[PDB]
Amino acid sequence: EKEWQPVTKLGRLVKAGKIKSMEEIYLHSLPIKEYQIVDYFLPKLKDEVMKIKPVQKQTRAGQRTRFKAIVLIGDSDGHVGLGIKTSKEVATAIRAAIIIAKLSVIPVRRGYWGANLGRPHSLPVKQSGKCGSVTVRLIPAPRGTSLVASPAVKRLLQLAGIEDAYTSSSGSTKTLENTLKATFAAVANTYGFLTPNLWKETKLIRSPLEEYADTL
């Protein structure tokens, strides 16, 4: 409720306003372990729960029931993530799920189909990912078409900021947890593809942690 005490060195620097934006963290690829960092840089992040499914376990007296919740978040402007956590109580699981989702927020790369006229709307290349017998493929599309996909993966692409795309699915897509995790991996790899316009050499600079001095 009241003001938080940073526990890691990165958290202290964020509280003092010594770093510009979250992309500075992304550039040096530093781990994030405190959910107050993300919402300090990215307000108006929407959250929306997918579904809850019970899970059983057999014991001598009877069967033990727990509840599993799936939650994904995004800002519709290039940031998205999801988290899954199970607990003995429905309400408790949802609260913990939102925290895990914030910790995993990642940026997306959005490009053009053909000619460029500002405000990129689609994926730069075609990318795909696999998570346990489910494969999802994304294809760039011309401006004007909407998102062509199942309701499950259309929501995730909506919150990532991607506007136009083509989709293809394989395997047992009825496993909702596996499908979302495969889509999340495909979008995450957009910045991992080396297009010719990125061939230019970059200058290496020291990380914020090394060149700043923290408080006691």
Partner: peptide, 21 residues
């Protein structure tokens, strides 16, 4: 069967927000 507390949650947004007649 987690449908008991959806009437007055207001702490999360569901996929298909159940419209009431």
């Amino acid at each position: 069967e987690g449908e008991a507390e959806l009437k007055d949650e207001q702490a999360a947004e569901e996929i298909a927000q159940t419209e009431k007649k």
